[PDB]
Amino acid sequence: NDDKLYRADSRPPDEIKQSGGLMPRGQSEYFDRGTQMNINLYDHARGTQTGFVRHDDGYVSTSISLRSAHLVGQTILSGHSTYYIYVIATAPNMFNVNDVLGAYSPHPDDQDVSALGGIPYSQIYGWYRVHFGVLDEQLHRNRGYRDRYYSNLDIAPAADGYGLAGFPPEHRAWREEPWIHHAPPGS
Amino acid sequence: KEMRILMLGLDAAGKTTILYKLKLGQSVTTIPTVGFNVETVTYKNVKFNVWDVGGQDKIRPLWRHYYTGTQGLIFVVDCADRDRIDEARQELHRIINDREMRDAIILIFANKQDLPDAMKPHEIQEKLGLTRIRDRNWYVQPSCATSGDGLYEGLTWLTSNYK
Ligand SMILES: Nc1nc2c(ncn2[C@@H]2O[C@H](COP(=O)(O)OP(=O)(O)OP(=O)(O)O)[C@@H](O)[C@H]2O)c(=O)[nH]1
């Protein structure tokens, strides 16, 4: 109920506050051109043909530890002299990607916990500033964090994410447990 | 006086519109909600903590994970959507029969009353099978979320009926 998650992000806290939280890529896409957000967990995990993030992505990735988020930062945000690691409470729009996609998880070493629809600002406990790749400062607490909202909630159980795996229609996972019980017609 | 409110309903019913009409006093352009929105609003001395959870079919299994602590359910219906009123009934009764929801009072927003052939509260009460609910209070409040009509009347009912 009161575990935290960790998200490396180049956007600073004032920008996040103004956006209302950590929003998915697909949200701006929807508002800008009407495209519906893609909530296929598999598509979020695999990304684009070229392996990049999809424009219509409905999910926001987080890490399960500080060390892991720092690694994400030093991999994806290596080009940024300053970035942030956001500390986030748990809520039931969050899915453990490897648990939902099972053995078909395309990048299981990510150990990603992903938030469907984004993470509201009130769910953000605080943040670490990372400068030149080093965490040299203590956590800064978010005054807008609301612990009473989240302390009684946990991430979604994998059983309730299987229906959101969203493998392509002809993918063999739909003929196997557990996803067979959510299979699209003909899959 | 705080009450934790869970606001549920089929996709497109007008839940998010309600939340931000109440919160911001404005009619906002919404995105279909795939996770949740949460805001707190104070009215007639009551601090309502309102959870707006997405209603698309694929994510309704997630609703139960917000039930604990809920003191009032707001169930929002699109009164112009006759094709899906039976589905709304089925989802309502699935919610209120969960043991974690037994004590929650139930405000139905019969929303989009501005639309031409919209079903009125009496019809909504009958099509949602509300008289089969005999162990908590419930009320059908007509509303137009876009204009705000009915919304504070609904919160007043909530205030009057929880203790
Ligand atoms: N005509 C009319 N349209 C309304 C009314 N209330 C909401 N809407 C519109 O209905 C559409 C859906 O409203 P939302 O508030 O996004 O619906 P929702 O219940 O949050 O849908 P999900 O996020 O999918 O769960 C929007 O275009 C709203 O402006 C109303 O009273 N009358």
Ligand SMILES: [Mg+2]
């Ligand atoms: Mg919504």
Ligand code: NA
């Ligand atoms: Na939590």
